[PDB]
CSV table of C-alpha atoms in Angstrom, one decimal:
chain,number,residue,atom,x,y,z
A,1,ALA,CA,-49.1,57.4,50.5
A,2,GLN,CA,-49.2,60.6,52.3
A,3,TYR,CA,-46.9,62.2,49.5
A,4,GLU,CA,-48.0,61.3,46.1
A,5,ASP,CA,-46.6,62.3,42.4
A,6,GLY,CA,-49.1,64.5,40.8
A,7,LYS,CA,-50.4,65.4,44.5
A,8,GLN,CA,-47.9,67.5,46.4
A,9,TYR,CA,-45.3,67.5,43.7
A,10,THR,CA,-44.9,66.4,39.9
A,11,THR,CA,-41.9,64.2,38.6
A,12,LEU,CA,-40.0,65.5,35.6
A,13,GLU,CA,-40.3,62.7,32.7
A,14,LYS,CA,-37.2,64.1,31.4
A,15,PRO,CA,-34.9,64.4,34.5
A,16,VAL,CA,-32.2,67.1,34.6
A,17,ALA,CA,-28.8,65.8,35.8
A,18,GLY,CA,-26.2,67.9,37.7
A,19,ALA,CA,-29.2,70.5,38.6
A,20,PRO,CA,-28.6,72.6,41.7
A,21,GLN,CA,-30.2,70.8,44.9
A,22,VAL,CA,-32.9,73.2,45.6
A,23,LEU,CA,-33.7,75.4,42.7
A,24,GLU,CA,-36.3,78.2,42.6
A,25,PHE,CA,-37.5,80.1,39.8
A,26,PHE,CA,-39.2,83.5,40.2
A,27,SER,CA,-40.0,87.1,38.4
A,28,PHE,CA,-40.6,90.4,40.0
A,29,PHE,CA,-43.5,90.5,37.7
A,30,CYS,CA,-45.0,87.6,39.1
A,31,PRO,CA,-48.0,88.3,41.7
A,32,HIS,CA,-47.7,84.6,43.2
A,33,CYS,CA,-44.0,85.4,43.8
A,34,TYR,CA,-44.6,88.7,45.5
A,35,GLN,CA,-46.8,86.8,48.2
A,36,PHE,CA,-44.1,83.7,48.6
A,37,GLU,CA,-41.5,86.2,49.2
A,38,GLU,CA,-43.2,89.1,51.2
A,39,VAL,CA,-46.1,87.1,52.8
A,40,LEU,CA,-45.0,83.8,52.9
A,41,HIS,CA,-41.3,83.8,52.9
A,42,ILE,CA,-41.1,80.2,51.2
A,43,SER,CA,-37.3,80.1,50.3
A,44,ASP,CA,-36.8,81.0,54.1
A,45,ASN,CA,-39.1,78.6,55.8
A,46,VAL,CA,-37.9,75.8,53.4
A,47,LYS,CA,-34.2,76.7,54.5
A,48,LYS,CA,-35.1,76.3,58.1
A,49,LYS,CA,-36.1,72.8,57.4
A,50,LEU,CA,-33.4,71.4,54.8
A,51,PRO,CA,-30.8,69.0,56.0
A,52,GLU,CA,-27.3,70.0,56.5
A,53,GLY,CA,-25.4,70.6,53.6
A,54,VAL,CA,-27.8,71.3,50.9
A,55,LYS,CA,-27.4,74.4,48.7
A,56,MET,CA,-30.3,76.7,47.9
A,57,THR,CA,-30.4,78.4,44.5
A,58,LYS,CA,-32.8,81.0,43.4
A,59,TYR,CA,-33.2,82.4,39.5
A,60,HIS,CA,-35.2,85.2,37.8
A,61,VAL,CA,-36.7,84.5,34.5
A,62,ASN,CA,-37.2,86.2,31.1
A,63,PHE,CA,-40.9,85.4,30.1
A,64,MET,CA,-42.6,88.1,32.2
A,65,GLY,CA,-42.6,91.8,31.6
A,66,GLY,CA,-40.9,92.0,28.0
A,67,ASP,CA,-37.7,94.2,27.9
A,68,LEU,CA,-37.8,95.2,31.6
A,69,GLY,CA,-38.2,91.5,32.5
A,70,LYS,CA,-34.7,90.7,31.0
A,71,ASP,CA,-33.5,93.8,32.3
A,72,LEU,CA,-34.6,92.4,35.6
A,73,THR,CA,-32.5,89.1,35.3
A,74,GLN,CA,-29.4,90.9,34.6
A,75,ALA,CA,-30.1,92.9,38.0
A,76,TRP,CA,-30.6,89.7,39.7
A,77,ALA,CA,-27.3,88.3,38.1
A,78,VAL,CA,-25.9,91.6,39.6
A,79,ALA,CA,-27.4,91.1,42.9
A,80,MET,CA,-26.3,87.5,43.0
A,81,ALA,CA,-22.7,88.8,42.2
A,82,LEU,CA,-22.5,91.4,44.7
A,83,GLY,CA,-24.3,89.0,47.2
A,84,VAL,CA,-26.7,91.8,47.7
A,85,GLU,CA,-30.0,89.6,47.2
A,86,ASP,CA,-31.3,90.4,50.4
A,87,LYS,CA,-31.0,94.3,50.2
A,88,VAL,CA,-32.8,94.6,47.0
A,89,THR,CA,-35.4,91.9,46.8
A,90,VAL,CA,-38.1,93.6,48.8
A,91,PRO,CA,-37.6,96.9,47.0
A,92,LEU,CA,-37.5,95.3,43.4
A,93,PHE,CA,-40.7,93.7,44.2
A,94,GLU,CA,-42.4,96.8,45.7
A,95,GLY,CA,-41.2,99.0,42.8
A,96,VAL,CA,-42.4,96.5,40.1
A,97,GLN,CA,-45.9,95.6,41.8
A,98,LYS,CA,-46.7,97.9,44.8
A,99,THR,CA,-45.7,101.3,43.9
A,100,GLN,CA,-44.8,100.9,40.0
A,101,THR,CA,-42.0,103.2,40.1
A,102,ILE,CA,-39.8,100.7,38.0
A,103,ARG,CA,-39.9,101.4,34.5
A,104,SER,CA,-36.7,101.1,33.3
A,105,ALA,CA,-33.1,99.6,33.8
A,106,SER,CA,-32.5,103.2,35.0
A,107,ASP,CA,-34.8,102.9,37.8
A,108,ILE,CA,-33.9,99.4,38.6
A,109,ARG,CA,-30.7,100.9,39.2
A,110,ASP,CA,-31.7,103.6,41.5
A,111,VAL,CA,-33.0,100.4,43.7
A,112,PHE,CA,-29.5,99.2,44.1
A,113,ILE,CA,-28.2,102.6,44.8
A,114,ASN,CA,-30.6,103.3,47.4
A,115,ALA,CA,-29.9,100.1,48.9
A,116,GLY,CA,-26.4,101.5,49.2
A,117,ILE,CA,-24.3,99.8,46.4
A,118,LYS,CA,-22.5,102.2,44.9
A,119,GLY,CA,-23.1,103.6,41.3
A,120,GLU,CA,-19.5,102.6,39.9
A,121,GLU,CA,-19.7,99.2,41.6
A,122,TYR,CA,-23.4,98.5,40.2
A,123,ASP,CA,-22.4,99.5,36.9
A,124,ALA,CA,-19.0,97.8,36.8
A,125,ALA,CA,-21.0,94.6,37.7
A,126,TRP,CA,-23.9,95.1,35.2
A,127,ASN,CA,-21.3,95.1,32.5
A,128,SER,CA,-19.2,92.5,33.7
A,129,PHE,CA,-18.8,89.0,31.9
A,130,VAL,CA,-19.1,87.4,35.2
A,131,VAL,CA,-22.7,88.7,35.1
A,132,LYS,CA,-23.0,87.7,31.3
A,133,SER,CA,-22.4,84.1,32.4
A,134,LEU,CA,-24.6,84.2,35.3
A,135,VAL,CA,-27.7,85.5,33.5
A,136,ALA,CA,-26.8,82.5,31.2
A,137,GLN,CA,-26.9,80.3,33.8
A,138,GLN,CA,-30.4,81.5,35.1
A,139,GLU,CA,-31.4,81.0,31.5
A,140,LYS,CA,-30.0,77.6,30.6
A,141,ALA,CA,-31.5,76.3,34.2
A,142,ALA,CA,-35.0,77.4,33.1
A,143,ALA,CA,-34.7,76.0,29.9
A,144,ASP,CA,-33.6,72.5,31.2
A,145,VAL,CA,-36.8,72.4,33.0
A,146,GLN,CA,-39.3,73.6,30.3
A,147,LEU,CA,-40.1,76.4,32.6
A,148,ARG,CA,-43.1,78.1,31.4
A,149,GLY,CA,-44.5,79.3,34.9
A,150,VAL,CA,-43.1,81.0,38.4
A,151,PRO,CA,-43.0,80.4,41.1
A,152,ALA,CA,-41.5,77.3,40.6
A,153,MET,CA,-39.3,75.0,42.9
A,154,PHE,CA,-37.4,72.0,41.5
A,155,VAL,CA,-35.4,69.6,43.8
A,156,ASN,CA,-32.6,67.6,42.7
A,157,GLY,CA,-33.5,68.1,38.9
A,158,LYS,CA,-36.0,65.5,39.3
A,159,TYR,CA,-39.0,66.8,41.4
A,160,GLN,CA,-41.4,69.9,40.9
A,161,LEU,CA,-43.6,71.4,43.6
A,162,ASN,CA,-47.0,71.5,43.0
A,163,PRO,CA,-48.6,74.1,45.4
A,164,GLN,CA,-51.9,73.8,43.7
A,165,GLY,CA,-52.3,70.6,45.6
A,166,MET,CA,-51.9,71.8,49.3
A,167,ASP,CA,-54.4,73.7,51.6
A,168,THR,CA,-54.6,77.3,51.2
A,169,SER,CA,-57.1,78.0,54.1
A,170,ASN,CA,-54.2,78.8,56.4
A,171,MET,CA,-51.3,80.5,55.0
A,172,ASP,CA,-48.7,79.3,57.9
A,173,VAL,CA,-50.1,75.6,57.4
A,174,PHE,CA,-49.5,76.3,53.7
A,175,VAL,CA,-46.2,76.9,53.9
A,176,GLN,CA,-45.0,74.0,56.4
A,177,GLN,CA,-46.9,71.8,54.0
A,178,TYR,CA,-44.8,73.3,51.3
A,179,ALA,CA,-41.4,73.2,53.1
A,180,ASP,CA,-42.3,69.4,54.6
A,181,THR,CA,-42.7,68.5,51.0
A,182,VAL,CA,-39.3,69.9,50.0
A,183,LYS,CA,-37.6,68.2,53.0
A,184,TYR,CA,-39.4,64.9,51.9
A,185,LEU,CA,-38.3,65.2,48.0
A,186,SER,CA,-34.6,66.0,49.4
A,187,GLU,CA,-34.5,62.9,51.4
A,188,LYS,CA,-36.0,60.7,48.4
């Protein structure tokens, strides 16, 4: 076929019932994730090609960067609750990987402050039990799929994207192949 298990995707031998339709995992510590976000805009180009009525979910993971890694997952829980993912994603990536000015929860906090979320609203969010369960979800979803590497995309709890089996000579072409694969898996 043109799309083959083991080639552009792999199949989970232990399918995950009730999973989000399109599920993406990343880490602000993850160099390929930086690329996926800053250079490739994967999540975006995938959305542009998904059918109508299909929700897209992105979670942070704990297994990179030790203590700051977990802090980053709580902060992403806060980003999700306040709906400010789009105002902090880039400064968080650049703060961890480019300028290396993120070294503590407080530095993470500064990014939100500078992005215009108010201190009181961030600290309130940070400590809320809505954020606790939202952290819990991110962890449970990662756990459900045996996740040990990022970036990672899962479709309908059954399929996992395999970008290692896609041409990388041209970045534009890489994205489209990637996005088209998600759309294929989507319709499966």
